[PDB]
Design a protein around this ligand. Structure first.
Ligand SMILES: COc1ccccc1S(=O)(=O)N1CCC[C@H](C(N)=O)C1
Ligand SMILES: [Zn+2]
Length: 139
């Protein structure tokens, strides 16, 4: 679990969005595993606007943060799960690291701010849904 709170927006994994997220929907993209809902309170986070390929992510299944080198956002094949059929997930960045299903929502950050959230895992890999291209989150 986990979310990004920026301005009057809440960013979560689309497969973990609640009834309340869907009732206050701003934007969603099944191919990216992202959903953004509106909030009444002002958020605690800042979004990175950069091309960093290193950062640190929070891993709930280890209660620890890990430093990672990750690929640029791209179209990557992801196997079928309880939440999605087998498909290509877009705007995904892979890194070598630990990730279990419940780790989705952990934040990846660089020195500039929030880069994205955990969205995929297994096999000693961790995949993050990028949010740096969503410029409207800042206004
Ligand atoms: C071992 O599998 C994981 C580990 C960490 C995280 C996720 C998995 S998952 O592949 O089960 N996963 C389930 C949730 C939706 C996700 C997606 N983005 O398509 C896929
Ligand atoms: Zn950066």
């Amino acid at each position: 679990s986990g979310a990004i709170y920026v301005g009057n927006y809440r960013v979560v994994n689309r497969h973990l969005a609640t009834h309340n997220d869907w009732a206050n929907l701003v934007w969603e993209d099944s191919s990216r595993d992202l959903l953004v809902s509106s909030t009444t309170a002002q958020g605690c986070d800042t979004i990175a606007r950069c091309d960093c390929q290193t950062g640190v992510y929070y891993c709930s299944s280890r209660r620890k943060h890990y430093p990672v080198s990750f690929s640029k956002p791209s179209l990557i094949f992801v196997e079928a799960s309880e939440y999605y059929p087998a498909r290509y997930q877009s705007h995904l960045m892979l890194a070598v690291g630990h990730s279990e299903p419940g780790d989705c929502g952990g934040i990846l950050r660089c020195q500039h701010g929030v880069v994205g959230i955990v969205s995929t895992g297994g096999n000693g890999l961790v995949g993050f849904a990028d949010v740096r291209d969503l410029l409207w989150l800042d206004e």
